Design a binder for this molecule. Sequence first.
Ligand SMILES: Cc1ncc(COP(=O)(O)O)c(CN[C@H](C(=O)O)[C@H](C)O)c1O
Ligand SMILES: Cc1ncc(COP(=O)(O)O)c(CN[C@H](C(=O)O)[C@H](C)O)c1O
Lengths: 399, 399
Amino acid sequence: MSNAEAFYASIRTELESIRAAGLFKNERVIATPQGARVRTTDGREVINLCANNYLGLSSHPQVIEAAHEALRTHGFGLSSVRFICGTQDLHKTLEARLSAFLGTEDTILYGSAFDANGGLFETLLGAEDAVISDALNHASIIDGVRLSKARRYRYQHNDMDDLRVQLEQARADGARYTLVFSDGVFSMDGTVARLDEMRAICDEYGALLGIDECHATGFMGQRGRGTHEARGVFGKIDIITGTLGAALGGASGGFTSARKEVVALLRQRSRPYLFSNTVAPAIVGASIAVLDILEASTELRDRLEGNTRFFRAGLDRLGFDVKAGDHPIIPIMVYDADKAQQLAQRLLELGVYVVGFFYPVVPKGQARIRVQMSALHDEAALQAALDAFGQAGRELGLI
Amino acid sequence: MSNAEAFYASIRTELESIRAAGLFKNERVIATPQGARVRTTDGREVINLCANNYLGLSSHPQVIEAAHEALRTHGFGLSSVRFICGTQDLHKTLEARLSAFLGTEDTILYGSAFDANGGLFETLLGAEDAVISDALNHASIIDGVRLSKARRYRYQHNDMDDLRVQLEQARADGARYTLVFSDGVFSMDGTVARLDEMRAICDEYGALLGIDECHATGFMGQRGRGTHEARGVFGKIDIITGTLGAALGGASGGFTSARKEVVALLRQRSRPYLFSNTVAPAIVGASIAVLDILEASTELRDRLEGNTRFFRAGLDRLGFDVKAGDHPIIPIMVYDADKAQQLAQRLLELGVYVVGFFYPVVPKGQARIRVQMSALHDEAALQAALDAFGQAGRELGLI
Ligand SMILES: Cc1ncc(COP(=O)(O)O)c(CN[C@H](C(=O)O)[C@H](C)O)c1O
Ligand SMILES: Cc1ncc(COP(=O)(O)O)c(CN[C@H](C(=O)O)[C@H](C)O)c1O
């Protein structure tokens, strides 16, 4: 045996254990645009309830037309990081619209939220500083922290008391600056961070407050500005990282929004911004259209909140356990991974499209279906999906 | 004075000393599509010699039209990671076409090359393994390796004897599996990895060979297939990472190409792939067309080769320390950061667009201009370019 081929056997062994544990993930091949209804390459039309397309913007024809126009005026790719020849007028324009929307001085675009998190902490913090994370923070945040030299603290999920004991330890350990950082809305359970309480704890210790708004920007708060708007601390957030790939168009791209001098150091020093391609023109141009849509009317935001309130009461009525609260992320816990796989594949036979979350996406013993509400769902699709959730939801033992 | 405001003052202090050191980067706002000539918002139209638009596909009309049709048929955003509702028939087709193009059994798409490298090493290698890296490996590779638990060795730049020293040491230190990793073509100096020696050196020790092919894919090799074709190792590479935002369209996306079991484990566990948005339907669609163009004829990469040799031989006979060759990346060393901004500025006034390179993009005191060739350039621009370099080179003590 050569070491190389041996390595391929340990890879094949790992792939077979993952199957055996029922933890293997099967891709489904959609053949149409992203939509509240969608058809896979088998011709079966189904109702999509597991997309980050909260506002219906991923195939919105005005967003589509803005991409078409931005291709005619601004080309297909730039093939350059921002500082060489990758900055068009669109990137500056969008950065100003994002900053105004989010309530901040400035904004720096990234290829993804993953990279915005990836290049945030290492640029702003050093070995003498501390970051204190909610224990449920998105993987991209964990990896951004791991790439920094800062001292690390984690506090129990949404546990404000634990947040206080960590800031005490952090101060006891002699932290210089301290950044408290959390998902604005948590990906896997839909809970909303208590930014109002966390603003207060932070001011008391003198710590910065950052949030990751991938599941909030565009539809949280009455004006859809985000978790910080929904919790009364709009204009009082040190650092907003977020995505363009969810409620604001769903194509690609991300951002960090902060004061002008934080953003300025990120342009000078943040490794995904120096060493990774700029956002494509068509994506930036459509993103500007998305901010016009949302600053002219809260109709999509409001319609989304209605579909969630309808569909959450609906799942409550059937004896399903309504995790979290107002949010469009409805996590239907099943704990066992195999049941999650069964329920998802049985809902596909009943014409509903959701998928199973299990390790490593969610902790072991905590598998689930994440149902996601879009503003685009019609009553027929929703009342139909409730039936399909009812049948399978009894036909497999969930109640 | 509160802790938060002191942090912000620290950031402002840091910005200032970046300006004083001659290291502050200023973006140019381009009002036009990417191309051989470009116009900033000040109306000036200049010759672009600093893009990754190596093949001119960034604004190629058939590429722009394929993005249009992809918008029509497959929408604008998918707003999902791949394992949920983020997989369309396009992603599958392109993963196959790339595997065929690169010599591999399968491909996995990422949002960028930065994230392809980000999620490689941590998914394949453990604390008991090793990674041997060329000292000048790309920042994204260093960051991928940092995120894994593998032991890290470093060999001197392109030094085949030192590569053998690390391989010996790693075995002596008891490494289980070993992966030797390198830029195919190196970002800041244009040198080509000696893949042919490395594949033989790696074979003695049963090590894996992995290569980053951003500055290669599309135009290196006879049929433009990469640094591995140009070294006659095509079909014999364990891992290829690479981008679509350089020669292959310039918009977004990346990939890792490997034996079907590597790719399958990356799908199961690679953190960027599970946890970050899928590539946008327009980019995959235009990417499939780019491979249509490049697999139909070698003309574009063939005239990139001509533009490179003409321009390399030109700067040589002008007095520039520029070797004759066909490395589309032509480094112009300047060492001083201030002298690099001045050379870029003076070349701008003379009708040529290039940008200074300085710390942390290159080592302190090793500042440069990175001329970058493209298949787009006609001889009248190539010639007018040379004239700009002869003069500003004369004016600044460079020749
Ligand atoms: C070898 C290598 N790998 C990976 C990446 C990341 O590529 P992507 O844009 O995320 O797809 C780059 C980006 N190279 C830049 C550039 O040379 O212009 C940077 C200034 O080094 C690269 O050179
Ligand atoms: C809080 C947070 N930050 C960052 C990201 C990555 O953002 P981007 O796609 O790289 O722009 C996500 C993606 N959430 C995904 C999803 O929930 O479907 C994933 C399965 O966790 C997120 O929830």
